[PDB]
Amino acid sequence: RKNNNKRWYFTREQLENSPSRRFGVDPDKELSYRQQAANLLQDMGQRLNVSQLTINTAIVYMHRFYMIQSFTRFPGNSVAPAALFLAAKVEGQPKKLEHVIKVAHTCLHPQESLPDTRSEAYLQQVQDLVILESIILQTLGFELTIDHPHTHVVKCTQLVRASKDLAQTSYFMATNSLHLTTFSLQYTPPVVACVCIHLACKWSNWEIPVSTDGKHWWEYVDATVTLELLDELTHELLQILEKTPNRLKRIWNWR
Amino acid sequence: VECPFCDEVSKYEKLAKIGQGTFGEVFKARHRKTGQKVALKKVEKEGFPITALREIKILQLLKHENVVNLIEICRTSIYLVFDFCEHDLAGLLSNVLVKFTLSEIKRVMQMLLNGLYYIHRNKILHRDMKAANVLITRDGVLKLADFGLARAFSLPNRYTNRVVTLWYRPPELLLGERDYGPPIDLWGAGCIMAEMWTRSPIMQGNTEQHQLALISQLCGSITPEVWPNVDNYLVKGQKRKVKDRLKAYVRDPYALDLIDKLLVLDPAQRIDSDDALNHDFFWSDPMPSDLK
């Protein structure tokens, strides 16, 4: 990765003073614009048949892109398709340009119909995407290698022998933390991963036993991590989850 | 549109073309403030070339004294910026005035093998091992260069067989292997090592079949006895002449023994960078010495 190490991690005050804020987008609006872009990425990604990993990667691109650019200048509905197109290439699941354009269009305009692939209006939207991919590459300074919390969750939930249930709920937490929060702009992936495992445990009434050494499980995942921070971050994630219609239902034990 | 993390290439002053790469031209240039010399490599139908993304991703991962260093990426088009390197092994070897002692040849092979150990440890195959892709700096530091065909690997892989220049291409690939690993780069290390004395690529085929024939006329013939399971995809009488045919140029026993262990037919019996580094060739007199 073209770094350095804390270039893409921001303080809450830095998150407050975002490029969009400068052009009069309220905090709450901006959070929404992020959530809608992530939703559009997930919708497109599923239809294009890329992996959750590829979608996740595109979501981080988007998140980072908007620490530099403003939603007032680049609409989420334009950046998402370019971000996904780029991420599919980067993650080794290249999707064709016409293909991403076709799927973007059906997601954004279900009732409309794709223009004629010979029209100047269609040739132009193909070019608008290419141009936007290039703007994204340059905004991210060509740092495209993304580390996700999922990598570290997998490690832990196995090295603690969690039920499939617990591990699946954690992966779910990790994925939703990308859609619903800006954790990826604030905390390292091993930390985010601890947050997700912690909440998954609380949600499932599971307790991971203290290690023989007297070390809590998260100490094997990230040394900076404290129970205070974990509880603060899980509460934040739980709150946005409760505000997202039908989301908790997916992990709710109905028996 | 703001762009904090992508500088304009105008910071560098173009001095002289020194080629034309895969995606555009190659320039020698000068930082306008410090004078630091660098190489600028410029970058179709599917937006930004996936091949260039791959190379960039790999250059950003690999940071090591014996691997070329990508400084940054610059806009204007797009340019990859590298620390400039005056020489390349193919050039120095095709130059009669240029002369290596046994001691320096040792050093060169040591740096090369050390670079390979590093890139492999990082799950990268270089896939384009050749003298011209080995750089040497004004200060005698060897750098593996040109990762445009390189690729990450892992652990039934179906990697592309369209890999490695023909003269440096290992048996496996010529027999159609797609589940190959680091041993392909080491075969190339072998061909380059031998080239340090012969001053010329030991096996210069014209087609894959000619290459496979040439390989047999040097390393013996492809035999399920020699190479367990090879018969799963030639000459029949050939016998190993690696040490005999190079006996002339090399002379030093240890050098010949190491080259013999590099140009081994079965990829799985071919020595790796770690063991190669441990070979007595690097640990007997004259011990490896610096370049000047």
Curated annotation (Swiss-Prot), chain A:
It is found in: Nucleus. Ubiquitously expressed. The modification Phosphoserine is found at residue 113. The gene is CCNT1. Cyclin-T1 is the predominant cyclin that associates with CDK9 to form a heterodimer called P-TEFb. P-TEFb forms a complex with AFF4/AF5Q31. Component of a complex which is at least composed of HTATSF1/Tat-SF1, P-TEFb complex, RNA pol II, SUPT5H, and NCL/nucleolin. Component of the 7SK snRNP complex at least composed of P-TEFb (composed of CDK9 and CCNT1/cyclin-T1), HEXIM1, HEXIM2, BCDIN3, SART3 proteins and 7SK and U6 snRNAs. It comes from the Eukaryota. Belongs to the cyclin family. Cyclin C subfamily. Regulatory subunit of the cyclin-dependent kinase pair (CDK9/cyclin-T1) complex, also called positive transcription elongation factor B (P-TEFb), which facilitates the transition from abortive to productive elongation by phosphorylating the CTD (C-terminal domain) of the large subunit of RNA polymerase II (RNA Pol II). Required to activate the protein kinase activity of CDK9: acts by mediating formation of liquid-liquid phase separation (LLPS) that enhances binding of P-TEFb to the CTD of RNA Pol II. The histidine-rich domain (HRD) region is intrinsically disordered and promotes the formation of phase-separated liquid droplets that enhance binding of the P-TEFb complex to the CTD (C-terminal domain) of the large subunit of RNA polymerase II (RNA Pol II). ADP-ribosylation on serine residues by PARP1 in response to DNA damage disrupts the phase separation activity of CCNT1, thereby preventing activation of CDK9. This is Cyclin-T1.
UniProtKB/Swiss-Prot annotation, chain B:
The keyword Hydrolase does not apply. GO terms for molecular function: 7SK snRNA binding; ATP binding; chromatin binding; cyclin-dependent protein serine/threonine kinase activity; DNA binding; kinase activity; protein kinase activity; protein kinase binding. Residues 145-165 are annotated as: T-loop. Keywords: Acetylation, ATP-binding, Cytoplasm, DNA damage, DNA repair, Host-virus interaction, Kinase, Nucleotide-binding, Nucleus, Phosphoprotein, Serine/threonine-protein kinase, Transcription, Transcription regulation, Transferase, Ubl conjugation. PROSITE patterns: PROTEIN_KINASE_ATP, PROTEIN_KINASE_DOM, PROTEIN_KINASE_ST. The modification Phosphothreonine is found at residue 160. The modification N6-acetyllysine is found at residues 37, 41. It is found in: Nucleus; Cytoplasm; Nucleus, PML body. It catalyses: L-seryl-[protein] + ATP = O-phospho-L-seryl-[protein] + ADP + H(+); L-threonyl-[protein] + ATP = O-phospho-L-threonyl-[protein] + ADP + H(+); [DNA-directed RNA polymerase] + ATP = phospho-[DNA-directed RNA polymerase] + ADP + H(+). It comes from the Eukaryota. The active site is at residue 128. Belongs to the protein kinase superfamily. CMGC Ser/Thr protein kinase family. CDC2/CDKX subfamily. This is Cyclin-dependent kinase 9. It comes from Homo sapiens. The lineage of its organism: Eukaryota, Metazoa, Chordata, Craniata, Vertebrata. The gene is CDK9.
